[PDB]
Design a protein around this ligand. Structure first.
Ligand SMILES: Cc1cc2nc3c(=O)[nH]c(=O)nc-3n(C[C@H](O)[C@H](O)[C@H](O)COP(=O)(O)OP(=O)(O)OC[C@H]3O[C@@H](n4cnc5c(N)ncnc54)[C@H](O)[C@@H]3O)c2cc1C
Ligand SMILES: NC(=O)c1ccc[n+]([C@@H]2O[C@H](COP(=O)([O-])OP(=O)(O)OC[C@H]3O[C@@H](n4cnc5c(N)ncnc54)[C@H](OP(=O)(O)O)[C@@H]3O)[C@@H](O)[C@H]2O)c1
Length: 523
């Protein structure tokens, strides 16, 4: 019942943690609430679900063989593919033996005299760890919205967060979709291809970009695999964790012609990268207007009915303020005779009856309702953990006025505690396989450092967190990601906004310097 590291979660981050700590000779025990490895990719399995970073980038670089040996089937892999891949990773590196599945971590309590963490689960486990590494991910489910009389609907209610493992037939059914986030936009066209009729109930609209999904050319598949090393070097030094430089010059500084060209070129790349076409695109609100504009045009081009195309246009929001969804023929979907878009602003949902949905305006006879839900606060997962630091102070208490960290990897009161890709670090703002690799590596080096010098622990200092808090406030003030209605907010912008490569530089030079900002503890 005692281990060197206790890891929470078995997705991209957790699985790499197990591998990395073990190679260094640490003993690991990992807990996963799910039944299998894969994290978001295991549980989030609705039709059409895929990543929005190129799969060649969005994958592990730690194992040169895996890199060579694994063939991605398309540009943006779907969840069953990414799932197969991670299960392959777990296969290859014998990871499962140190995971306990179906087990939810409930509390973690610091012993201050010993600098150990007693960790407890909902399955009755009680284990002692030198280091607690939480790798619980940035995305947890948003709540299921209370709909009056949902309990009376006689047909089928399918949740995108809990999709049936053996599929759902929409053939011949009248289907209603509530929600138009990634879950919605990704599944809608698939539902639409086989449903009898599809009604899409829209509260607000969000920006999505055509995936432009091509399967990779054989002759390029080996040519990329030869240039992997140089592709990884670029992404690590980059800003988003991908091998992509933004435009040299500013948005408005370059001619109207030369802007429509770059905007078009980045439109091919898709979604995430499109918000990073011009340097000031997520800084200068006039420059962002030019993007909104380029986007609006493309949508009126593809949607037949202006009334509908107007409804599909996100109204009075900044583009890239919330991450752009990547889709496969989503807007096209609305040109079909069997799909209708319903304006929830015009006629809100007042509840459900036996036969379907009730808006103020009409009733909808439906056989099936798909709740296409969204995602809770960046912290999210961690809120459901009970983490008791020094003084018997709780992490929730400590973060009462917003998250406070040093580099994201330090919090005073919480020695030997490491939260993986969350507040204080680039987080969801960079490729997260690479971000997970960076953080695990950093923790691993820190443990090694301690182990060398004969020291008991590492702990963020009061002084260091406040500076980092200040710093995170300052990188953010400029950004159009710093809206009032932005997901990135606590109570406080949560991610570090300065760029991945820069962030990597910082935490690296911190290690090299003997962990300045942290206290080293003897215990
Ligand atoms: C549709 C979609 C597309 C995406 N595309 C991209 C992309 O292209 N690029 C990118 O960088 N990111 C993308 N993301 C973000 C994605 O959330 C992360 O890339 C990925 O989830 C990070 O892996 P992780 O291990 O850090 O966290 P997760 O995959 O979320 O895994 C965390 C695991 O920890 C477990 N856990 C949490 N709390 C507990 C507890 N108390 N006890 C036990 N287990 C627990 C959870 O069960 C989960 O299995 C996408 C997300 C979605 C939903
Ligand atoms: N690669 C990545 O790292 C990645 C990928 C995707 C997303 N993200 C991040 O995660 C966040 C969430 O993503 P998401 O778009 O899936 O979630 P979301 O924005 O909550 O999308 C869910 C949709 O359901 C709707 N909805 C919610 N409650 C409703 C109700 N009662 N009735 C009708 N409709 C309702 C929402 O509109 P209303 O809110 O107007 O009701 C929204 O259109 C984003 O902010 C983004 O920053 C990151």
């Amino acid at each position: 019942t005692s281990y060197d590291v206790v890891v929470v979660g078995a997705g991209i981050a957790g699985l790499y943690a197990i591998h990395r700590f073990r190679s260094q000779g640490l003993t690991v025990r990992a807990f996963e609430a799910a039944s299998g490895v894969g994290g978001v990719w295991y549980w989030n399995r609705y039709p059409g679900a895929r990543c929005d970073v190129e799969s060649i980038d969005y994958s592990y670089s730690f194992s040169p063989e895996l890199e060579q040996e694994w063939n991605w089937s398309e540009k943006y892999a779907t969840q069953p593919e990414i799932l197969a891949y991670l299960e392959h990773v777990a296969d290859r590196f014998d990871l499962r033996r140190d995971i306990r599945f179906d087990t939810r971590v409930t509390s973690a309590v610091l012993d201050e005299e010993g600098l150990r963490w007693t960790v407890r689960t909902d399955r009755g486990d009680e284990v002692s760890a030198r280091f607690l590494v939480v790798a619980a991910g940035p995305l947890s489910n948003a709540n299921t919205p209370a709909f009056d009389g949902l309990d009376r609907f006689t047909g089928d209610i399918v949740h995108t967060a809990r999709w049936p493992h053996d599929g759902v037939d929409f053939t011949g059914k009248r289907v209603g979709v509530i929600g138009t986030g990634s879950s919605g936009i990704q599944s809608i066209p698939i539902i639409a291809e086989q449903a009898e009729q599809l009604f899409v109930f829209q509260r607000s609209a969000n920006y999505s970009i055509p995936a432009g999904n091509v399967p990779l050319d054989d002759a390029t598949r080996a040519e990329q695999k030869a240039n992997y090393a140089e592709r990884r070097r670029l992404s690590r030094e980059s800003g988003g964790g991908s091998p992509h430089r933004p435009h040299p010059k500013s948005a408005l500084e370059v001619s109207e012609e030369e802007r429509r060209a770059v905007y078009e070129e980045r439109w091919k790349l898709g979604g995430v990268l499109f918000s990073a076409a011009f340097p000031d695109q997520l800084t200068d609100p006039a420059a962002n207007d030019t993007a909104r504009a380029f986007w609006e045009e493309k949508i009126r081009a593809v949607v037949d009915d202006p009334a509908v195309a107007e409804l599909l246009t996100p109204k009075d929001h900044a583009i890239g303020a919330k991450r752009i969804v990547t889709d496969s023929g989503y807007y096209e979907t609305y040109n079909r005779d069997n799909v209708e878009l319903v304006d929830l602003r015009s006629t809100p949902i007042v509840g459900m009856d036996e036969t379907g949905i009730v808006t103020t305006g009409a009733h909808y006879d439906l056989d099936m309702i798909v709740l296409a839900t969204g995602f809770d606060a960046m912290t999210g997962s961690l809120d459901k953990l009970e983490i008791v630091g020094r003084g018997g102070r709780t992490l929730k208490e400590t973060w009462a006025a917003g998250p406070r960290t040093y580099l994201g990897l330090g919090i005073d009161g919480f020695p030997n505690f490491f939260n993986l890709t969350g507040p204080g670090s680039p987080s969801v703002l960079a490729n997260m396989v690479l971000h997970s690799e960076l953080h695990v590596d950093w923790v691993a080096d820190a443990i090694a450092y301690l182990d060398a010098r004969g020291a008991a622990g590492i702990e963020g200092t009061p002084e260091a967190v406040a500076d980092w808090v200040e710093e995170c406030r300052n990188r953010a003030e400029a950004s159009l990601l710093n809206s009032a209605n932005s997901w990135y907010l606590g109570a406080v912008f949560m991610p570090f906004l300065g760029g991945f490569g820069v962030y990597r530089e910082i935490i690296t030079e911190v290690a090299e310097s003997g962990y300045k900002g942290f206290a080293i503890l003897e215990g």
